[PDB]
């Protein structure tokens, strides 16, 4: 026996990240970078975990956080997590174990200006709050406050993450809710209220390799913001990019969860119209 | 969720490639074409073809012959291998004009003509594009590269003509007379080729050589095919003989040697190829 099929690369991977040459750095952040781009969402799992690349791309984000830098090797550091931790519990607890959120409120603190730095950090949690288990670590009362007002950043591709971070919390309940109920319900209303006011964004914010996160933020009739959001996004990457999406709502089973809103009888209006809006779109994908 | 996948790798491309570091870029340039000789080839990216097409762009504007213009130029080689696809966005993108450009600023670069000349060898490969290489100050440059003295330059220059030629008479569009001075000027230079020092080239496959072989009447195109299957199989046996044999080389090569009326410079070189490819037993 010898060392296992990944110390080469790993050993590989630190040399470039902590050379005195930052062109290495740059080298390695881009070929992380195109990796998380291009393989699947277990192999970038199988890799983060046994490359510790969440490890490694969050020592880069604290050197660029020391500095006050911003550069393009932040952004695709950022971006990198943010990709990393698509659909993927285990790249998300691994953030959560290396101080992950203590440095992404660094980031948020240090860079309030930066919006598409802020885009890139609560994209990363946002995929976060989508872990159950993981829950509990985002209960921290700065943290809601500070996206509690990023909620209502007049930039939609800041506040669409706030929002979504927000409905996954609320989401599940008063039982997990380990804040005051006052301040969770007050949110619960300026989350509807915030979405009412989002222009159509002209670009994509975000691309999705599955619509199931969303499915149980559909059936919480009792916390309408929390639905509103979910349908909202459904219908802005339908309607933005239908040959991806539309036959994926279906096959996921989107159609009962929208048949469920539409027919419920007591129903939130707002959430009516974009339920059946999305239907209709996805009726003439006949 | 996470960003878009596609985007994110065109950004990183563009943010390397276009880097002011220029160790950066030349790295950058380095990695991207030593990754498109090795990947497999199709399955496109025309956003790097792009990029790098800017690059010989500006490379000619200030007039630099460096490592960074040559690895940019061996990146477009290599990713026009085998690609019709990329080959047509190169012409798309005004890529037949800027080459012409180089070609005419660097008329003693001979490393740099030999990676230009490469990448037209492989669009003069791809019957679609025919009509685009139908220019009359395209085929007046290549047509004097025919004849220099470096056989690297003249080798690729050779294999353009040689695509070109084999196509008939009623492809080709520009003057008949040029076409058979052309004819004559292909069989007359290729017999005055010294053995080249180095493998000039690589080939994933012999596909588009052997149409060429078949061209008994205008002996020049074969003897181009003949004279380059003899090269690689000699400087890279095992590697080109297994290659030749498996697509059907032998049967090619001795339907050449058992025609009665074979160019004796062409049938030579065949006979070689095929002892050759034997005592590969």
Same mark, same amino acid.
């Given at each position: ?47 983060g975990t046994e490359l510790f690349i ?43 174990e290396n101080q992950g959120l203590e ?118 009739? +009792?916390? *309408?913001? @929390? !639905?509103?959001? =979910? #349908? ?21 089973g989107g159609l009962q969860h929208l ?7 007591? +129903?939130? *209006?707002? @959430? !009516?119209?974009? =339920? #059946? ?10």
């Amino acid at each position: 026996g010898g060392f296992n099929r990944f110390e080469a690369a790993k050993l590989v991977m630190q040399w470039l990240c902590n050379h005195e040459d930052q062109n290495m750095q740059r080298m390695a952040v881009a070929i992380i970078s195109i990796l998380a781009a291009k393989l699947s969402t277990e192999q970038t799992a199988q890799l983060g975990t046994e490359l510790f690349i969440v490890r490694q791309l969050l020592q880069i984000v604290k050197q660029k956080t020391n500095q006050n830098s911003v550069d393009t090797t932040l952004k695709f550091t950022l971006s990198a997590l943010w990709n990393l931790t698509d659909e993927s519990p285990t790249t998300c607890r691994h953030f959560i174990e290396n101080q992950g959120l203590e440095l992404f409120m660094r980031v948020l603190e240090s860079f309030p200006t930066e919006s598409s730095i802020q885009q890139k950090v609560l994209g990363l949690l946002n995929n976060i709050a989508e872990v159950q288990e993981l829950h509990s670590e985002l209960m921290w009362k700065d943290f809601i406050d500070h996206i509690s007002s990023l909620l209502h950043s007049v930039e939609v591709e800041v506040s669409y993450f706030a929002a979504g971070i927000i409905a996954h919390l609320i989401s599940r309940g008063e039982q997990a809710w380990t804040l005051s109920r006052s301040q969770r319900n007050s949110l619960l209303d300026d989350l509807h209220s915030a979405i009412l006011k989002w222009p159509t964004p002209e670009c994509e914010m975000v691309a999705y390799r599955s619509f199931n996160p969303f499915f149980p933020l559909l059936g919480c009739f +009792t916390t *309408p913001g @929390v !639905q509103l959001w =979910a #349908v909202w996004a459904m219908q802005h990457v339908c309607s933005k990019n239908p040959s991806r999406y539309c036959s994926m709502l279906i096959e996921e089973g989107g159609l009962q969860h929208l048949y469920n809103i539409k027919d419920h009888e007591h +129903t939130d *209006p707002h @959430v !009516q119209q974009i =339920a #059946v809006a999305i239907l209709d779109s996805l009726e003439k994908h006949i």
